[PDB]
């Protein structure tokens, strides 16, 4: 109904001044890359910025930056109007002011540091009246353009002169400092945030909506996960994008107080929130204030629970106050909180993941001048085991380290000192490893539930395995339709058996990859240390972790471990029945109707397996997993040698096929091996050099040798003489002993109807 | 969505239904953004909640009870479970007997046994 076509959305890359459409529509706005266009939002106010295109912008949204989105004061979600203007006038003078509070950061000259740098050849068009963000000197400072000799607007050009004022002028306080808190601020969560957004828009966004239609919205989230992980971030980035008044009840704040006036302090709180629509009441640190009942004595513990319960259920669906909370975990706080209506809803931040890491990374590092030696992703793979604030608390100790080396050596510090000075230091890659070495996790013992990055091709051949896990995995989701129109219920349970290291692991990792869903695995230690400290609740906790992640592919890689340790396979005097393993019968047996879980089960002896794992409902489908193939030799050989610079004249093809039975962990061994005796090499010939050279100052020419520059093929013979065939033939024969007792009998495969 | 929702509760259908129905408002509706104080009924009217809606909720549901042991009067009849008619006649026997006469067994003075065990291979149906 010749509707608006522009909608505010969140921004993916780094720029701006810059607005993203969609691929699939050129002609409706007319308008192809690299050119000036208007954007009329709201409070009569209009901007203007280049626009792009993007494939992965959804037709129905326009991604946006937050800068250009607080020039029109428009939000996310929002619905504003596009106009395409190829016309654009250039500037003379572009006049510019320090605005809002942000002052001390600059030091005798103060236009040379940060704008100079941006506005050259950026081709930026300014209009009055704006406030763009300047990144430098490990600060940010937002600049307003007051005057400017063209009107209303003009794109900027090297050709015209800079006015300069160096004199701070206090912003309107009803516009909003872009220092606070975003979406953009808060990543390495990613769908998490998402489903916080979707709960929230609704109650927030569209707040009339609900009175004029009766239904419930979401008024009660607990945000739980391990300390560091942005769950308070994550409320106040909801609160500012959404607009909603934004209460901070913390946990200690309110405790701290004289018992019988700190529930006044708590039920103050909750008038006020009630008071001004919509508004997010954060209680941060929750199980402090209503933590576990009867395990609480004190007296008046009891009394703020209540207290808490009573404002939780009395909130008389007035207004649009949603009741955030953050919690370690679940089952730290009173669990009559958690009741309907209360707190019905949580989401699990949990630790990042790599990318996650990567993210944080990046919000973390952006006005440091992060080295050209470093690029981010080598901190952020040996980074596991830290949570953004500890990412934050890295990045901050390369910066302090950085400015330790240099500047402070030189001992000429002011008040402020000047910026541009700090703008020449770039924190070296030297001081992000000597940070990742003052790490400490810090949360390295949580579990890890994470989309696996190994792919089919890291998993040479295993063309039939591999089209299986595809099916039982794969063909469920993407054709739930077809499943139900036939009848059938997909089942939820794999079991790979074969022998060690043939890459069992890697194909469970590589079919969670495929579907793109999170990958949990329990090893065999954690199972064992579930049977000896006979705790096998905690694996109720790992299903419940499976159905938070969901969907998921758990893994429970080497499940015979517990059945080992009975004995082997002659075992104890009792059967095949253990504790963790009824447990995960029992979690399997109710693990029905989530059907995003599904269970992976791997195991080297599968003649010691409990029975009961492969009854109906449970881990039917057996898998085989045998040796690599030579065609699957060759691959894994490619797979692990990619990194190691390896040189062209090595025949990999022929090492492949002479390893006749190798497993895939034998030919990981054989190359690390040989890229163990090429570093040796290097490393022997290198000193043994540079000991004779440093005899004479200057002796020998500057000539730059590298002695060992790849891996040799004397290298590969090197590693060959130690080749170790791990795989008897004998465990072999017990491999294809048990599939033959899995077989199908015989005599039905002439099977024929009558015709 | 009723077979589906097993372990679920009836607040907890109250939520999937509400959940639902915000999807579908979310998809349609909202979309187009025209909200005011009071939307006008008739084009709420227009948007019914899809299956689509309801498998989505279905998808974020999350029990809620699922733990709890369930007592439920099976739905499985006599056509479901194939032959065993002198197995089926006993079990009649029984069971049904002393419910539907109970006059008649105290009429011969003798005390219905309740408890009976199956026994056979692995997968006949017990
Ligand atoms: C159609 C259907 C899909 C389904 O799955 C949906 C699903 N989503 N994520 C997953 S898994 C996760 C995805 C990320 C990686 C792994 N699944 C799933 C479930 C089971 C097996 N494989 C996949 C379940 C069960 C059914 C149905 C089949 C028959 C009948 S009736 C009338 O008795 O005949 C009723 C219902
Ligand atoms: C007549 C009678 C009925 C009975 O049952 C009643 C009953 N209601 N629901 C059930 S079971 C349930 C129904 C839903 C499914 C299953 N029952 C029941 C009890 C025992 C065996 N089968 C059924 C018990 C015992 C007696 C009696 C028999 C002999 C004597 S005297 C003088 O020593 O001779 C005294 C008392
Ligand atoms: N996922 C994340 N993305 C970006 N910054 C993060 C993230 N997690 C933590 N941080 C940083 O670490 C700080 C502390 O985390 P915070 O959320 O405030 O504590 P809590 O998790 O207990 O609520 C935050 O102020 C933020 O700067």
């Given at each position: 109904?010749?509707?608006?076509?522009?909608?505010?959305?969140?921004?993916?890359?780094?720029?701006?001044?810059?607005?993203?459409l969609?691929?699939?529509?050129?002609?409706?706005?007319?308008?192809?890359?690299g050119?000036?266009?208007?954007?009329?939002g709201?409070?009569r106010?209009?901007?203007?910025?280049?626009?792009?295109?993007?494939?992965?912008?959804?037709?129905?949204?326009?991604?946006?930056?937050?800068?250009?989105?607080?020039?029109?004061?428009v939000?996310?979600?929002?619905?504003?109007?596009?106009?395409?203007?190829?016309?654009?006038?250039?500037?003379?003078?572009?006049?510019?002011?320090?605005?809002?509070?942000?002052?001390?950061?600059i030091?005798?000259?103060?236009?040379?540091?940060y704008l100079?740098?941006y506005?050259?050849?950026?081709?930026?068009?300014?209009?009055?009246?704006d406030?763009?963000?300047?990144?430098?000197?490990?600060?940010?400072?937002?600049?307003?353009?007051?005057?400017?000799?063209?009107?209303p607007?003009?794109?900027?050009?090297?050709?015209?002169?800079?006015h300069?004022?160096?004199?701070?002028?206090?912003?309107?306080?009803?516009?909003?400092?872009?220092?606070?808190?975003?979406?953009?601020?808060?990543?390495?969560?990613?769908?998490?945030?998402?489903?916080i957004?979707?709960?929230?828009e609704?109650?927030?966004?569209?707040?009339?909506?609900?009175?004029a239609?009766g239904?419930?919205?979401?008024?009660?989230?607990?945000?739980?996960?391990?300390?560091?992980?942005?769950?308070?971030?994550?409320?106040?980035?909801?609160?500012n994008?959404?607009?909603?008044?934004?209460?901070?009840?913390?946990?200690?704040?309110?405790?701290?107080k004289?018992?019988?006036?700190?529930?006044?302090?708590?039920?103050?709180?909750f008038?006020?929130?009630?008071?001004?629509?919509?508004?997010?009441?954060?209680?941060?640190?929750?199980?402090?204030?209503?933590?576990?009942?009867?395990?609480?004595?004190?007296?008046?513990?009891?009394?703020?629970?209540?207290?808490?319960?009573?404002?939780?259920?009395?909130?008389?669906?007035?207004?649009?106050?949603?009741?955030?909370?953050?919690?370690?975990?679940?089952?730290?706080?009173?669990?009559?909180?958690?009741?309907?209506?209360?707190?019905?809803?949580?989401?699990?931040?949990?630790?990042?993941d790599?990318?996650?890491?990567?993210?944080?990374?990046?919000?973390?590092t952006?006005?440091?001048?992060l080295?050209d030696?470093?690029?981010?992703?080598?901190?952020?793979?040996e980074?596991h085991?830290?949570?953004?604030?500890?990412?934050?608390?890295?990045?901050?100790?390369a910066?302090?380290?950085?400015?330790?080396?240099?500047?402070?050596?030189?001992?000429?510090?002011?008040?402020?000192?000047d910026?541009?000075?700090?703008?020449?230091?770039?924190?070296?890659?030297?001081?992000?490893r000597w940070?990742?070495?003052?790490?400490?996790?810090?949360?390295?013992?949580?579990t890890?539930?994470?989309?696996?990055?190994?792919?089919?091709?890291?998993?040479?051949?295993?063309?039939?395995?591999?089209?299986?896990?595809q099916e039982?995995?794969?063909?469920?989701?993407?054709?739930?339709?077809?499943?139900?129109?036939?009848?059938?219920?997909?089942?939820?349970?794999?079991?790979?058996?074969?022998?060690?290291?043939?890459?069992?692991?890697?194909?469970?990792?590589?079919?969670?990859?495929?579907?793109?869903?999170?990958?949990?695995?329990?090893?065999?230690?954690?199972?064992?240390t579930?049977?000896?400290?006979?705790?096998?609740?905690?694996?109720?906790?790992?299903?419940?972790?499976?159905?938070?992640?969901?969907?998921?592919?758990?893994?429970?890689?080497?499940?015979?471990?517990?059945?080992?340790?009975?004995?082997?396979?002659?075992?104890?005097?009792?059967?095949?029945?253990?504790?963790?393993?009824?447990q995960?019968?029992?979690?399997?047996?109710?693990?029905?109707?989530?059907?995003?879980?599904?269970?992976?089960?791997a195991?080297?002896?599968?003649?010691?397996?409990?029975?009961?794992?492969?009854?109906?409902?449970?881990?039917?489908?057996?898998?085989?997993?045998?040796?690599?193939?030579?065609?699957?030799?060759?691959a894994?050989?490619?797979?692990?040698?990619?990194?190691?610079?390896?040189?062209?004249?090595?025949?990999?093809?022929?090492?492949?096929?002479?390893?006749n039975?190798?497993?895939?962990?034998?030919?990981t061994?054989?190359?690390?091996?040989?890229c163990?005796?090429?570093?040796?090499?290097?490393?022997?010939?290198?000193?043994?050099?540079?000991?004779?050279?440093?005899?004479?100052?200057?002796?020998?020419?500057?000539?730059?040798?590298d002695?060992?520059?790849?891996?040799?093929?004397?290298?590969?013979?090197?590693?060959?003489?130690?080749?170790?065939?791990?795989?008897s033939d004998?465990?072999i024969?017990?491999?294809?002993?048990?599939?033959?007792?899995?077989?199908?009998?015989?005599?039905?495969?002439?099977?024929?109807?009558?015709?």
């Amino acid at each position: 109904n010749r509707p608006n076509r522009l909608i505010v959305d969140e921004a993916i890359n780094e720029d701006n001044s810059v607005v993203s459409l969609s691929q699939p529509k050129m002609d409706e706005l007319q308008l192809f890359r690299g050119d000036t266009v208007l954007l009329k939002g709201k409070k009569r106010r209009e901007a203007v910025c280049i626009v792009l295109s993007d494939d992965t912008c959804s037709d129905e949204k326009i991604r946006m930056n937050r800068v250009v989105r607080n020039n029109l004061r428009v939000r996310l979600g929002d619905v504003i109007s596009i106009q395409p203007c190829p016309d654009v006038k250039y500037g003379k003078r572009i006049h510019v002011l320090p605005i809002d509070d942000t002052v001390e950061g600059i030091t005798g000259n103060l236009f040379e540091v940060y704008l100079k740098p941006y506005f050259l050849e950026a081709y930026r068009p300014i209009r009055k009246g704006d406030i763009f963000l300047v990144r430098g000197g490990m600060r940010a400072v937002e600049f307003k353009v007051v005057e400017t000799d063209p009107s209303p607007y003009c794109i900027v050009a090297p050709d015209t002169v800079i006015h300069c004022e160096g004199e701070p002028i206090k912003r309107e306080d009803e516009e909003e400092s872009l220092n606070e808190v975003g979406y953009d601020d808060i990543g390495g969560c990613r769908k998490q945030l998402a489903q916080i957004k979707e709960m929230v828009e609704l109650p927030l966004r569209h707040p009339a909506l609900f009175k004029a239609i009766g239904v419930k919205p979401p008024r009660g989230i607990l945000l739980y996960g391990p300390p560091g992980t942005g769950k308070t971030l994550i409320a106040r980035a909801v609160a500012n994008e959404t607009g909603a008044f934004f209460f901070l009840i913390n946990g200690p704040e309110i405790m701290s107080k004289l018992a019988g006036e700190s529930e006044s302090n708590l039920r103050k709180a909750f008038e006020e929130a009630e008071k001004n629509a919509p508004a997010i009441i954060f209680i941060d640190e929750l199980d402090a204030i209503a933590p576990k009942r009867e395990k609480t004595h004190g007296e008046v513990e009891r009394r703020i629970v209540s207290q808490l319960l009573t404002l939780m259920d009395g909130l008389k669906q007035r207004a649009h106050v949603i009741v955030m909370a953050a919690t370690n975990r679940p089952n730290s706080i009173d669990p009559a909180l958690r009741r309907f209506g209360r707190f019905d809803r949580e989401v699990d931040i949990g630790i990042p993941d790599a990318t996650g890491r990567l993210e944080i990374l990046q919000i973390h590092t952006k006005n440091m001048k992060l080295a050209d030696d470093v690029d981010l992703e080598q901190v952020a793979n040996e980074t596991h085991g830290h949570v953004g604030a500890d990412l934050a608390a890295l990045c901050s100790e390369a910066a302090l380290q950085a400015i330790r080396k240099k500047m402070d050596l030189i001992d000429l510090e002011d008040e402020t000192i000047d910026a541009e000075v700090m703008n020449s230091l770039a924190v070296t890659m030297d001081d992000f490893r000597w940070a990742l070495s003052q790490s400490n996790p810090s949360a390295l013992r949580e579990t890890v539930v994470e989309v696996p990055q190994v792919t089919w091709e890291d998993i040479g051949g295993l063309e039939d395995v591999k089209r299986e896990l595809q099916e039982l995995v794969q063909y469920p989701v993407e054709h739930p339709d077809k499943f139900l129109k036939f009848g059938m219920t997909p089942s939820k349970g794999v079991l790979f058996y074969g022998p060690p290291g043939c890459g069992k692991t890697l194909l469970a990792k590589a079919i969670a990859n495929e579907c793109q869903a999170n990958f949990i695995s329990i090893k065999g230690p954690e199972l064992l240390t579930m049977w000896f400290g006979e705790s096998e609740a905690n694996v109720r906790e790992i299903f419940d972790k499976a159905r938070q992640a969901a969907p998921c592919v758990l893994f429970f890689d080497e499940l015979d471990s517990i059945a080992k340790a009975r004995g082997g396979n002659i075992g104890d005097g009792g059967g095949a029945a253990d504790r963790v393993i009824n447990q995960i019968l029992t979690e399997m047996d109710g693990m029905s109707t989530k059907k995003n879980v599904f269970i992976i089960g791997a195991t080297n002896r599968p003649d010691i397996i409990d029975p009961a794992i492969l009854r109906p409902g449970r881990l039917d489908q057996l898998i085989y997993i045998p040796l690599p193939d030579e065609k699957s030799r060759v691959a894994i050989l490619k797979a692990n040698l990619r990194k190691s610079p390896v040189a062209k004249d090595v025949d990999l093809e022929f090492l492949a096929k002479m390893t006749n039975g190798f497993s895939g962990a034998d030919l990981t061994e054989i190359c690390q091996r040989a890229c163990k005796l090429a570093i040796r090499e290097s490393i022997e010939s290198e000193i043994r050099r540079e000991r004779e050279r440093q005899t004479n100052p200057s002796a020998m020419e500057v000539e730059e040798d590298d002695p060992v520059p790849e891996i040799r093929r004397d290298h590969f013979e090197e590693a060959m003489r130690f080749a170790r065939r791990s795989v008897s033939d004998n465990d072999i024969r017990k491999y294809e002993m048990f599939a033959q007792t899995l077989q199908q009998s015989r005599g039905f495969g002439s099977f024929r109807f009558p015709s």
